[PDB]
Design a protein around this ligand. Structure first.
Ligand SMILES: O=C(O)[C@H](O)[C@@H](O)[C@@H](O)[C@H](O)CO
Length: 402
């Protein structure tokens, strides 16, 4: 009865966020064959992984500027059709230099995925259901990064390894042109409902660099929010890049690739829904999403307790609970669109994950730096410290709705 096509764009985004995260972990799937063919060393492989991580964060502040400058639609086509071509060409790469360069190119076009979807969902879902929308396409990340990894392995072992980059890259190419022709602003869309467009707008859904603005974006209210995701997105990047299973593996654990990614799946899902229901009630817009972020980041510190047993106990349960707190508090960016000024929606989205994605580059490096000289115990307290620092820095500098 009410507007129904508004969620169509949400599904297309969910599809995009899935495809975007498949091209993130497709390299890890083939990482057991890429080293052997080119004769690459373990250290050199790190360049291939790092190539995507670095440019992904560095190419957000240009993307944030590129998003507002060029628009919200064409940017995603250039993005989807951008990285999808790089990934496709990676299947025909000759030498690690071709892989490092292409993975760099892949990170460039895939960087403006976070700010572009945010404005896209904010121009279509700036209401109470933005958290349910934010908690919807984020689940596709945990699903798209994992639930498709077995299918890649199936295509990897039976057929050649190149098809993993042709499938993931080829699907993205088709999806860009598909998405390019179907999605468009609400008024300019073919079928617009008289009630939906007003329904979308009643919540706030609408279609050079200044020195002053340059210093204002780095404000206390946004700074405390920037630091918040530095502790949220980081925990997800261990699983993406550096450390699924590396050193000291006999007395680390013993199935591990699906447990935390479900707890976060429903974690982001219900958390986006809990904040969604709370906000429509007599609670503030920030407090409805702030609350599940604080306790979540507090739940994220639950992993510190896994070392008290050192015995084949139910660590996996509290492991999923600790990862549930990150997912439950994974809608930390659902409010960045609100606090950010109307003029600079793209830049804030970049500088935002520029702290979160950076967390995916520095936090994994810290956990590794102490595991050789010390062990895993200082790594669990650090993740809890970053989560506590994330929570602590949030509750103090949250500053509600600026
Ligand atoms: O790519 C992205 O959207 C960001 O990394 C981040 O928003 C996601 O990883 C998730 O929402 C939080 O970890």
């Amino acid at each position: 009865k009410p507007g129904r096509r508004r969620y169509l764009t949400l599904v297309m985004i969910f599809i995009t966020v899935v495809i975007c995260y498949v091209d993130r972990a497709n390299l890890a799937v083939a990482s057991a064959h890429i080293q052997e063919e080119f004769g690459i060393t373990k250290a050199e492989m790190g360049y291939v992984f790092s190539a995507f991580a670095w440019l992904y964060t560095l190419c957000q502040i240009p993307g944030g500027w590129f998003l507002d400058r060029v628009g919200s639609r064409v940017t995603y086509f250039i993005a989807i059709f951008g990285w999808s071509v790089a990934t496709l060409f990676q299947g025909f790469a000759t030498g690690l230099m071709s892989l490092i360069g292409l993975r760099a190119i892949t990170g460039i076009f895939q960087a403006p995925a976070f700010p572009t979807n945010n404005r896209m969902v904010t121009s279509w879902f700036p209401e109470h259901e933005r958290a349910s929308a934010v908690g919807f396409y984020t689940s596709g990340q945990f699903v798209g990064l994992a639930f498709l990894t077995p299918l890649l392995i199936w295509i990897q072992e039976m057929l050649s390894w190149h098809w993993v980059f042709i499938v993931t890259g080829g699907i993205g190419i088709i999806w860009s042109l598909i998405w390019f022709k179907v999605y468009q602003p609400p008024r300019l869309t073919k079928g617009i409902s008289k009630a939906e467009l007003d329904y979308i707008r009643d919540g706030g859904g609408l279609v050079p660099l200044t020195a002053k603005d340059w210093k204002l974006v780095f404000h206390r209210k946004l700074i405390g929010v920037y630091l918040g995701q530095f502790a949220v997105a980081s925990t997800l990047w261990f699983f993406l890049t550096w450390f699924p299973n590396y050193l000291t593996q006999e007395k680390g654990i013993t199935f591990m690739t699906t447990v935390p990614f479900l707890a976060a799946f429903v974690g982001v899902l219900l958390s986006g829904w809990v904040a969604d229901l709370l906000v429509r009630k007599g609670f503030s817009l920030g407090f409805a999403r702030k609350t599940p972020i604080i306790c979540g980041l507090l739940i994220s510190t639950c992993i510190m307790g896994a070392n008290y047993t050192n015995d084949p106990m139910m660590i996996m349960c509290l492991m999923a609970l600790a990862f549930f707190g990150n997912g439950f508090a994974s809608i930390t960016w659902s409010l960045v669109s609100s606090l950010a000024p109307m003029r600079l929606i793209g830049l804030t989205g970049g500088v935002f994950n520029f702290a979160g994605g950076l967390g995916g580059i520095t936090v994994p490096l810290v956990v590794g730096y102490l595991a050789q000289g010390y062990g895993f115990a200082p790594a669990l307290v650090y993740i809890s410290a970053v989560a506590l620092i994330g929570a602590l820095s949030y509750i103090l500098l949250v500053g509600d709705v600026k």
